[PDB]
Amino acid sequence: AFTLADRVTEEMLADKAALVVEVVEENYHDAPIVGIAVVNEHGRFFLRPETALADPQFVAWLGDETKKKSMFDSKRAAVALKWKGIELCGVSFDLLLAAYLLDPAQGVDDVAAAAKMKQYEAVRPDEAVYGKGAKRAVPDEPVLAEHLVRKAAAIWALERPFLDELRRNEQDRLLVELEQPLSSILAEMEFAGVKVDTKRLEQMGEELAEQLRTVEQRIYELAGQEFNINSPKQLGVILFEKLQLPVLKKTKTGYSTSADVLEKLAPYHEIVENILHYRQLGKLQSTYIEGLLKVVRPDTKKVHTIFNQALTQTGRLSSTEPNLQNIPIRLEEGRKIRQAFVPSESDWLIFAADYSQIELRVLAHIAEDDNLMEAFRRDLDIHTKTAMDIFQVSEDEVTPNMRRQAKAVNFGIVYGISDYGLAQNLNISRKEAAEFIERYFESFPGVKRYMENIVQEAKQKGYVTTLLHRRRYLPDITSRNFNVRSFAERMAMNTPIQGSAADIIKKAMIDLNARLKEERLQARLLLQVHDELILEAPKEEMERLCRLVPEVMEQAVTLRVPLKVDYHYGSTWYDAK
DNA sequence: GCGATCACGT
């Protein structure tokens, strides 16, 4: 049983408690808090939010760093409280992060899923209480209050066994010194938001919409017909049935119309280049112009992403609603979208710092490949050096095409090395890609050794680890299905690289946050994009930041090779280039 | 409401 409390009392403010600050809306920014549960040594309590969040003693308890709280997904609550002007401190255990570190592949997304990991089932899944999608709703107080108290009681019961397993995994410091401090930094980042120049976006959208009508009309005059270009159904019967274009690859139901295939088809018909142009314009228009404008808060012209900290299998963050980690930059037309991301105050600038080749530097260090480490010690262009070695030529003999292919091997080697994906990527045969690999491994024998040894260790231990002891279990490494096994071997090779890079930038974020506060700087972290950090700061702080941010990022860990950080600043995200 | 394509990023 539990107390359905009318007012806050002192026994609810013990210095240790499991706390539930329930925000049911998926996007928690400026979202309602529907209820609160506290379990401590004195009892189990449900508090209505409009009561507890108005009680200065409860608010003081929330904000006291010496009163320790155990929670599930504290960042959700922390941010929902930030929007009410209330500080959340003292969160010493986050069950969501603890479950994520113990096994990311469980997809642990609620308290019930995490409790099942320890044979605790006295709590319902959120989706069983709230419903799914359309039918989603907050239930009556008795049903809500029992759910929140069952979640708090589970967190209370589950902290010792999770912490015990984290300790056995040598992951206790990972949780307490990396992921939980990082949760607080991400909350500040999401709450700060990023300013959007919405007239610029709107003006871009009208230009795209003009160029989309023109290209659309050209596609119809080239097909002799009107049809929905956005549908691979109709597009396939225009291209491969009406126009008789060669079918270079079939999908499951019909024909494939990837940009992979269409570029091969361009010699045969003028329609193909126009379809490709239509698709690129439509992507910007749909995902990045209209998509962004839909999530901008009209009162502040800011977007407030949500960083999913417990989702990827490698330890990367992900970014939702909006995804600020896939804003275009490769092609110039779409890169202009970054002009609409601006500082949130006058006379501030955007500052962006990015690791140079962090994955291949981590691999140099992890593999202790003499040739790879020396390449980075000499600060070589790694793709050109790899080409010199694979093709056995001097620097001046590296053609652009050789460097492009050596680059593809290098991006392949970070992924699962297997040829078919390189052969597909380089539009070559398996037979030829295989010999690319063989010549790479003759040049970097320590990488070869590391790739053999890590697959062997994944089979022996059942998991691979990153630099800071993140793990990923790989049960498919023993499968007798060749596809399933190969996927697990590729993950065994990639995950210590991709995941160690993720560890490093997360530690840098923590180190950067500490330094900016020590230095009393107004600069604020806004975004992380896997290997870059994006800040905004007063114009008067740029010179100091040029020295500070790269140093902190470069010194986050000490590897057998240097870490290298490039950085740029400008009046928009675009100009920070 | 829900897989399958497709395309955007690192």
Place this chain on the structure above:
DNA sequence: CGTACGTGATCGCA
């Protein structure tokens, strides 16, 4: 069939 890891939009079916 497979390059690694994500998110979002569109379509099409039931």
